[PDB]
């Protein structure tokens, strides 16, 4: 009898439960680094006293002992340093063995083999493979997160909420992160194998996967495709031919599957929250605690001015220059880890933003940027801090440009307009947690001023009191199909009567400020006595905005006002029209492996038919993949009632998400929390 292995029992279910990886829909062994796992190995005899056993684990195509991507270890007393295997018991020919990886092991798929030295002879057999993840339960892991409820929210929750809209109207969409769905973990690992860092130098790339700063950076870079290799094709054009409207996605699952199955070819099309939701799946799946952050009025300053410019003409059109300097909202991610590169005070939440691309400066993403560091203006620290600081801190400079004379002049500088209502989902609920005070000191504080100057450090001319002030107000209900009713309020603050000319326009836009089409314009001249206040009505019919309104449902309203011998005043507001309501109802108790009938309700509010009607539904633990249901054309003002079944696989509170689309309403959303009984 020369010593050899007969079987190995990996005790997969037990180890996954101990490792907090039991929720993944997978039969693989999935472990977290730095933590032991127990296997039973059946040999052909008891251990001979001359003989030797070594385990070998390796990851990646060029594994190296000096790079920590290969390790060779005997049965021993154990180890801090590295990998170790402890013989816990021998029972006949069966060995109870506790194997452990270091807290600094690279994540990813590993192979394990066993090399047996016996009778001046050596055997070797492949034992199997496993996946190794970051370990936010382990206090020596860089991703350690100590609080149980936060760890559950930020690693283990597969349903999410992303805040959208504007500073005037904060809404939300549901997002199915779906990191436990079939093949999603494996696809998120594949992101790392598809990076340019991997193709160029796989040995270095794999060895680098021990560092969450590196993994987060590579992951964030891959989501918004900057070549033909990333996950999503970005598109803020309003025109989504060849693809899906970015607003029609409800989760990361469909995206990541389509990516993989297409040969890792970009999925068409995403915008910033689509990237953030997808990046969030990847991070949580690999064990980096993470969450989605929305910033309102988010500035795009690549110039390190800490200021952006927006251009108008005297006729009250937004111009293309700077029309997207300040996004109504912009969504990114935070991940949770220490920053060994920065030091003890810069640990915790780190900004990771898949959206940015500046090829001229080699930026395929931003971060990780210590939020602590952003807030103190330590913008010399790695990575992408000047851009991130600016996103939440920039000044807004408004310019007039007159195409007839080619003259440009600075109208106003406005501080405190950018970086507002910075929002993320609360732990354990759908509430909006405001985290503005994490990125910034309080508005118009000494600290705020110190931080801004500090940061600025590391990176006519007169001032008017105009006679006339203005404000755009909404009258009544903003909804697609209904007319838009606004009023421009002007008030004369000077000691004398003034005559003001007002030129006004209204442009459909994408939420970042991409201008689509003029749909309405007006002008007015009026005299106002001192303190007089006047109202000019703005009415935009359905027929006027319908042809150019995008899934954003947004319209940019501008009024440039001018009294003789005074600087212009620019009054502006981006409005959001509500979709018609789409309702979901569960018609009986949700229980695991029992059919649950669900009802969609929709009333067409248009006096025309809506056609090409599709209802799309998904929800982790409720449906496998997604349901797409062809809905009959609705006539004018007609209602629709669609019944469908889900079939829950997992108990607890789950999230059902529904998209209804037709020719006139590209992406109406609905969501339901459903409590699923066991």
């Amino acid at each position: 009898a020369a010593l050899g292995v007969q079987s190995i029992n990996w005790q997969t279910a037990f180890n996954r439960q101990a490792h907090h990886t039991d929720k993944f829909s997978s039969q693989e062994l999935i472990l977290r680094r730095g933590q032991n796992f127990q296997v039973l190995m059946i040999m052909n005899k008891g251990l001979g006293s001359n003989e030797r056993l070594e385990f070998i684990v390796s990851t990646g195509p060029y594994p190296s002992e000096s790079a920590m991507t290969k390790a060779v270890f005997p049965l021993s007393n154990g180890s801090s340093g590295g990998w170790s295997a402890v013989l816990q018991a021998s029972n006949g020919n069966t060995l109870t063995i506790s194997i452990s990886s270091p807290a600094s092991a690279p994540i990813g798929r590993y192979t394990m083999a066993l090399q047996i030295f016996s009778q001046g002879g050596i055997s070797s057999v492949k034992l199997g493979t496993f996946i190794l993840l970051f370990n936010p339960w382990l206090n020596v892991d860089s991703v350690f997160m100590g609080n149980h409820a936060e760890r559950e929210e930020y690693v283990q929750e597969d349903a999410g909420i992303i805040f959208v809209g504007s500073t005037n109207r904060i809404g939300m969409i549901g997002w199915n992160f779906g990191q436990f769905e079939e093949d999603i973990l494996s696809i998120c690992l594949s992101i790392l194998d598809r990076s340019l860092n991997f193709r160029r130098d796989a040995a270095t790339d794999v060895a680098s996967r021990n560092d969450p700063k590196y993994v987060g950076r590579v992951l964030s870079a891959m989501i918004n495709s900057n070549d033909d290799n990333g996950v999503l094709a970005g598109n803020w054009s309003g025109t989504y031919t060849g693809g899906r409207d970015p607003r029609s996605w409800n989760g990361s699952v469909e995206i990541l599957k389509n990516w993989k199955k297409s040969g890792f070819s970009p999925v068409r099309y995403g915008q910033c929250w689509v990237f953030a939701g997808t990046l969030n799946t990847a991070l949580r799946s690999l064990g980096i605690p993470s969450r989605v952050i929305t910033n309102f009025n988010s500035a795009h300053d690549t110039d390190r001015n800490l200021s952006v410019d927006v251009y108008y003409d005297p006729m009250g059109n937004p111009l293309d220059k700077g029309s997207d300097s300040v996004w109504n909202f912009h969504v990114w991610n935070e991940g949770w880890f220490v920053r060994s590169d920065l030091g003890p005070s810069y640990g915790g939440w780190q900004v990771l933003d898949a959206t940015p691309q500046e090829r001229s400066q080699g930026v395929f993403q931003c971060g990780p940027a210590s939020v602590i560091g952003v807030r103190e203006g330590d913008v010399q620290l790695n990575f992408d801090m000047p851009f991130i600081f600016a996103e939440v801190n920039a000044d807004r400079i408004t310019w007039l440009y007159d195409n007839t004379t080619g003259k440009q002049w600075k109208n106003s500088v406005n501080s405190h307009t950018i970086g507002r209502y910075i929002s993320t989902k609360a732990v354990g609920s759908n509430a909006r947690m405001d985290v503005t005070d994490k990125y910034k000191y309080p508005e118009g504080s000494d600290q705020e001023r110190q931080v801004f100057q500090k940061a600025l450090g590391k990176l006519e001319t007169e001032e008017q009191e105009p006679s006339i002030i203005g404000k755009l107000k909404v009258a009544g209900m903003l909804a697609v199909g209904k007319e838009v009713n606004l009023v421009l309020l002007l008030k004369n603050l000077s000691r004398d009567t003034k005559t003001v000319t007002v030129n006004m326009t209204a442009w459909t836009i994408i939420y970042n400020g991409t201008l689509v089409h003029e749909v309405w314009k007006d002008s007015a001249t009026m005299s106002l006595d001192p303190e007089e206040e006047a109202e000019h009505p703005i009415k935009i019919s359905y027929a006027q905005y319908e042809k150019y309104l995008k899934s954003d449902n947004m319209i940019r309203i501008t009024a440039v006002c001018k009294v003789p011998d005074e600087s212009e005043v620019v009054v502006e507001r981006d409005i959001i029209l509500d979709n018609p309501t789409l309702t979901l109802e569960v018609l009986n108790e949700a229980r695991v492996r029992k059919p649950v009938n669900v009802q969609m309700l929709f009333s067409n509010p248009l006096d025309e038919p809506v056609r090409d009607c599709v209802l799309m539904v998904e929800g982790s633990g409720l449906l496998l993949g997604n349901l797409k249901i062809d809905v009959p054309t609705l006539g004018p003002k007609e209602g629709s009632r669609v019944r469908f079944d889900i079939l829950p696989s997992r108990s607890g509170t789950k999230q059902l998400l529904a998209d209804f689309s037709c020719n006139k309403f590209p992406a109406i959303k609905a969501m339901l929390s459903i409590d699923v009984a066991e």
Partner: antibody
Amino acid sequence: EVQLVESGGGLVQPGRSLRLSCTASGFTFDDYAMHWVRQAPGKGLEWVSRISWNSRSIAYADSVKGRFTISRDSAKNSLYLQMNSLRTEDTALYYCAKDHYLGSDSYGMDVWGQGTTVTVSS
Amino acid sequence: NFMLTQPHSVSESPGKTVTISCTRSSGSIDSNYVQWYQQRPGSAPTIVIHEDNQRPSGVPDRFSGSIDTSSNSASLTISGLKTEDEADYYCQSYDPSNVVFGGGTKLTVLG
């Protein structure tokens, strides 16, 4: 519903040419790859050619490279197959199909036309 | 490239369940989506499964699909066989250029 109406098939002599057409309705033509697939009598489905939604990626079965050309015309919602150098083994029912996939470079045929028959004999 | 190999034929009696497999010759069956088509005599094919296991609007729930990584194969399974399910069945996938069809399986519902 989706309609794909094929035409241009008939009897043709080896060495010579046909051009097939397929006109589509009932969906956004320009959203989807389109394909020609063919079936010889009593035989399986053999894919012939794919053109991407934007006309910028084309693929051909090895059996037809050099000889067949696929194209599409957005304004006419039409797909074409130029078939040169015909051989009697090109004899087949030629189906026009719409790709299922919206916004990814995966392929499958969600809707098939009834086909136009091509018979190559001298 | 690769080929997809299906059995030449399968039969089962009405009410019973049948499975038709489709084996990919190289690369993983799970690398690319698998579709299934039904073709009755004299008709064009119609899709019955797409994206491995999703059922098109109006295909009955008796039709399901699956992937088995063990055998590198996809399967179409039809529960509750009716006489009208008798047809040729083809699987189909692709690499990033080319579409591959399996050879086709005749499904006889024994009568």
